[PDB]
RNA sequence: GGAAACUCAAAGAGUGCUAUGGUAUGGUGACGGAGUGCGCUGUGAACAGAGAGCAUUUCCGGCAGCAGAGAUUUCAGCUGU
């Protein structure tokens, strides 16, 4: 009761956009019209970098939205403070880079290069060349566990402890190259998507996948998980988006026959669903729900209110988008594409009320230092990763549920 | 129990109220000996309840001589009678922490319900409030304490030596 | 439940209302018919929903054919919102 | 009763000091021991 | 707890200044314990309507305990007047984290439902309010 | 179309003036804070590891000890830091435990000073000056009880004939002494237990059950007129001083070395005896112990209660002391030292934070009752962190990985080897009694709490 | 953090204030973010008593809006629930926190006392006694707090015993400012005037004198003289007998000017025996002051006291029946003064003539008075 | 190696700042204030008190009429609902 009474103390309110008419649909609202309708600070957050010569840019944001990490396909990796004008690493690693991520900070980032994964400090000096992690295409950091997770063209999934420096786990996927990869933020299990149409949920303890789901036909192009750890959207190459229950492993929605295969999905902190099919980005609101009236449609046939039309859409007319990522605590969607970066003002798309002692967008240098030491001190072991997080206080599922009083012994 | 504390100083008299006792048995330990150097933990021990300032350098010199030769002056009588509760004289006296074992008898001669303590616990409480000084007083005195100290030291010395300017 | 002026004054204080502030910033302002009718458009009658460009100048979802003077006014407002009206003409 | 009303009351300046307001403006904004380096 | 050192009374009850002993020897030449000044003002329809000036005079005149007794007398008088398959979960044992769960049910509980109802709420700063955190950790 | 985005505004989150701290907005959503079991498991594990590295319990020995091993100790129950100790060569000493130095020493007797306690002597001709004199009295095997006064510098009220204000005299030796907590009375055990008061030079009453001698004595702390004593016929006798008579006794298997009464429960006491464990007894029903504290490996020499009544300290003949939570029955903590031999006396200081042990090499040593606990005053952030960590270790107490760390100590080689052969002996007798119970017909299930009483006068119905 | 504690202490009153349907959730979130701003500014570093004062003003404004909205929505004047005292309790606690943090601005202490007194029946006079006790403990030398404390407990509660105790304790602490002496003689005259007027009133419906005021007058002269001779000539007595007699003369001038002010504001107490109560100050000033006020310098002061003793019955209106009764007393006074004085003889004659002419058909009896004093 | 600075970062040391919840406001009409009784302080008595405890239906936090109080708002008692 007292923890739930804090919603009075919550400072800000979430954003939205609402149609106020029946002629005014919401998917036909233009980004210039948003930038005219919203304030100058948000209009200046909606950046656009036109970086033409190196390849399509994989985008990545820090877990508070302060730093941006872009990687060109050719060699151009830049870590920057996108909201000031401060870049702190611009390094041209002339072999084909694939992906990057921050580790626990803007102070270290890991890039997946031609073969080996490299780890660079704040100003861009190379700290580590990982001799394992042979061909990564997907990196993701587990921040409460301090684990860099790596998958790619080899059929192997590798968990590497960044703090000690020690390769925690090597797991045979046994299903060829890893086509997609996402992390459950709830329980830190890794959902990998293979060329079978199979998602598999993995933990660094079990050398077998915790679960194998048959998501799609063909391969699995992209996976996204809600931050509540309840829903998972997977796009296959069979032009099929599929919304999955994670906890009970039901299949909630099956949007089949997309016009072209969805190359990316992302889920915001307030539960929007951003699908990207090449030039097009399309966002649905309240699509991750149980009822059949929340199945994401593309039009409402005759004005049906029980059809989830897109919340907003945008067309990147020149190019094909490389990846999607919502900016964490702001109302923006950063999409990285062939000619650089574009933020989109998506009004419903961010937690307005962060917690400032989990992760703070205004944090200072001293706060970064002490929070780094404290989270390093309370780093969770990699063995505590289970399918449910609340299963490390309990008793065994063997060892009879009644305690025994030695008369019965 | 060291309930109240009397700190004499050139600007006047201060009565502090002891909030938390320091350790008696662990009083020589390292953490107990340097908690009186840290101000953030000394303010957990000592709270200021009263400060009667002097009427000037004349009453300052009078009270400096009375404190020097171990007598209770009239301003001392006033501030102690204002601040200390009317305890019993036969059962559980109120405990005042002084720094002068021959000023104690002059305090019990005037207030029989007051037992006075100046042993090592009262000594390091007293030197804690001496070490911090102007920070404990929360801004309530006129005059910088070291400037009044210079004036009172020169006045006390010339009085004690009978310095004549003729 | 009526309003009140004293109640709304100290409510604007308590809730931190800059509404009169923006009103004063917008207000203060630094103070210190036609020569022809053709009689053919009135009896023409256009379709609307046949091409996607004219599909936007409906005011309902049941409009399918409109009168010519109405249709001319719809695309006059549409021209005015493509090219906004400058100040040199009026 | 009017004489009790007009008896001189005890005067302070304390609650007037509570209700006091101010007329204040705002006015604008080597070592002894170091030998001289020749 | 002894009686507090107040500034409304005398913390010694014997005259402590020359002023105090002078005032008390004059006041014992002519005492002012105000039993006379209690019995003088403990005396005072048309008493309600017509006496609207002597009532205000006695209201201004009466002292502290006199006014307390007058309020009690009016209260007592008025109170006397009135009243083929899509999900394949592996069920292998997690031998690496069966050290993060206890071996049996500990002593004071009788079953794991009771014991996990003990463990079900985190006492952390991050998960409770500040007041609830303090109540849980004292 | 109405439209609204997140307006963060930077005045609420980074402060205007530089002198003040930044705002910390909170949001108590479990979505925002995901790993709520693992995170406080690791905080409880780091708290147990921090306790095992902060466990520095030895404060210091006081003085230079004695010459011949400390066999009697008495705290005074009204002052925090004063302690009287007596050795085998007849010397007694009064100690200021703040400065760790003796107020005075006294060649008290010629034999062993076999008991000493402290008094506020209610004379009815003189008036006791308890703000400058402390009083300790002490009995020995040279048939004397002597009462001494000590000059004490604790108040500075005054400015004196310190030692031996009187000398009580018995015909046989004495073995224990304890003073009543009012009314000028004490009691001395020995060849027979006598009651005395500080005015009369002879015993007021002889309160002996039979003609069997008395080895130890303790008065109750509340309900102050109830005495208890240990006789060398393995007997524990209760006396009442209203009836001026013994009350009830029990005979155990082996000999009770000491008693201490619970200062918070007034009818419970703990006995410390020669089979290597302590027994928590209720005065209203002595037919069963209501706890057994088992972890010692040789004869338990002395026991004492915390003044909070919540834990006991227990020093034994294996050269180690042990602290026990009162509801458990196994040791919460063991203190040992290569220099400490045969701890014969243990007291629990009135702070409930330090533990005084008198060994028999001569030394009296201070210890912390909680080893990881420091004695400075604490700001609210560190006090909140410490009690958060205590609650967290409490609710994760039985996880195997933190239980194996909190359970861990370094015990000496002799105590460890005696412990493991004690384990294999007890496991062997449990195996053999299980076999014998499988065969034979009527083998009664005797409780552990009853397994050590051979009998009881004044039977219970 | 403790701002978190205080902010979530603020939540039950707005639970109740949303349940009673006067505020809505979107406006109570606005008052919580303003209150968050204020609580953070209060218990962070670099804090100010103006932060405390602005928080008190904001809480009083939301209290007034709450009362207005209650009268407009529920049409009651209090909901007799939590949300009509919690906010005044909050203001009282902000005051207590501020006076514990900065106990040095008497403006804030007096705003605390004013709000606590004006809270009315809901406060407690022992709660006002507690903050009077700690304020007088911190500032014993500041004398207007003693006057305000005794004025509250006499001019509101009429507690003569406690008021006498307050004045005696204040005069114990600073027996050096004459203002506390004058307010004590004022209180004693007011108390004896109320005593004799309640005697007159009980007579008209159906021993203890100003000698209290004279005794405190006597110790006022003695201790004010002692403290001025100790204040000036401060460190030592290194001064020859010229400077010692110069000092003693000046303390006589100081003390006698204060007694001149004493009689000047003593005359208006005319309901007791004002003649006796002024004549006793006259006879207390008439005696010797160890440095020859009469037989040497301060002869102007001797002439002033002689003029006062002459007109001490002639303190009258233009109806001069007392003058026609005892102007021969003034003539004998002028004769006895001019029998000894040299220039004070002419000064006292011209001054008594000018005073009687200024103060005094009706001009024909005044022509008799002019012929008398010509 | 050198130079520049209202340049950008990474760290170290010292100093400053009431840096003060030993278990957080006087009060979820479950409440507060007033008074009484018990309790407490300096075996019975009177006296002097403290604000530091505990009840309970003794009244008030209902309405006017009316005069009074301070700076048009709040404050203070009589006759009945």
From Swiss-Prot, chain A:
This is U3 small nucleolar RNA-associated protein 7. The chain holds residues 58 to 466 of 554 of the full protein. WD repeats lie at residues 51-92, 173-212, 215-254, 257-294. Present with 5800 molecules/cell in log phase SD medium. It is found in: Nucleus, Nucleolus. Interacts with snoRNA U3. Interacts with MPP10. Component of the ribosomal small subunit (SSU) processome composed of at least 40 protein subunits and snoRNA U3. One of its GO terms (cellular component) is small-subunit processome. Involved in nucleolar processing of pre-18S ribosomal RNA. GO terms for biological process: endonucleolytic cleavage in 5'-ETS of tricistronic rRNA transcript (SSU-rRNA, 5.8S rRNA, LSU-rRNA); endonucleolytic cleavage in ITS1 to separate SSU-rRNA from 5.8S rRNA and LSU-rRNA from tricistronic rRNA transcript (SSU-rRNA, 5.8S rRNA, LSU-rRNA); endonucleolytic cleavage to generate mature 5'-end of SSU-rRNA from (SSU-rRNA, 5.8S rRNA, LSU-rRNA); maturation of SSU-rRNA; maturation of SSU-rRNA from tricistronic rRNA transcript (SSU-rRNA, 5.8S rRNA, LSU-rRNA). It comes from Saccharomyces cerevisiae (strain ATCC 204508 / S288c) (Baker's yeast). Disulfide bonds: none annotated. Keywords: Nucleus, Repeat, Ribonucleoprotein, Ribosome biogenesis, rRNA processing, WD repeat.
Swiss-Prot record, chain B:
It is found in: Nucleus, Nucleolus. Required for 60S ribosomal subunit synthesis. Interacts with NOP1 and NOP58. Component of the ribosomal small subunit (SSU) processome composed of at least 40 protein subunits and snoRNA U3. Belongs to the NOP5/NOP56 family. Present with 13500 molecules/cell in log phase SD medium. This is Nucleolar protein 56. The lineage of its organism: Eukaryota, Fungi, Dikarya, Ascomycota, Saccharomycotina. The gene is NOP56.
From Swiss-Prot, chain E:
It is found in: Nucleus, Nucleolus. It comes from the Eukaryota. Interacts with snoRNA U3. Interacts with MPP10. Component of the ribosomal small subunit (SSU) processome composed of at least 40 protein subunits and snoRNA U3. Belongs to the UTP14 family. Involved in nucleolar processing of pre-18S ribosomal RNA. Present with 1470 molecules/cell in log phase SD medium. This is U3 small nucleolar RNA-associated protein 14. The lineage of its organism: Eukaryota, Fungi, Dikarya, Ascomycota, Saccharomycotina. The chain holds residues 320 to 880 of 899 of the full protein.
From Swiss-Prot, chain G:
It holds the Pfam family HAT_PRP39_N. InterPro entries: HAT, TPR-like_helical_dom_sf, Utp6, UTP6_N. Keywords: Nucleus, Repeat, Ribonucleoprotein, Ribosome biogenesis, rRNA processing. HAT repeats lie at residues 86-118, 123-155, 158-190. The keyword Ribonucleoprotein applies. SUPFAM superfamilies: TPR-like. One of its GO terms (biological process) is endonucleolytic cleavage in 5'-ETS of tricistronic rRNA transcript (SSU-rRNA, 5.8S rRNA, LSU-rRNA). GO terms for cellular component: 90S preribosome; nucleolus; nucleoplasm; Pwp2p-containing subcomplex of 90S preribosome; small-subunit processome. One of its GO terms (molecular function) is U3 snoRNA binding. It is found in: Nucleus, Nucleolus. Component of the ribosomal small subunit (SSU) processome, or 90S pre-ribosomal particle, composed of the 35S pre-rRNA precursor, the U3 snoRNA, and at least 40 protein subunits. Component of the PWP2/UTP-B subcomplex composed of DIP2, PWP2, UTP6, UTP13, UTP18 and UTP21. Interacts with U3 snoRNA. Interacts with MPP10. Component of the SSU processome, a pre-ribosomal particle required for the maturation of the 18S rRNA from the 35S pre-rRNA precursor. Belongs to the UTP6 family. Present with 7520 molecules/cell in log phase SD medium. This is U3 small nucleolar RNA-associated protein 6.
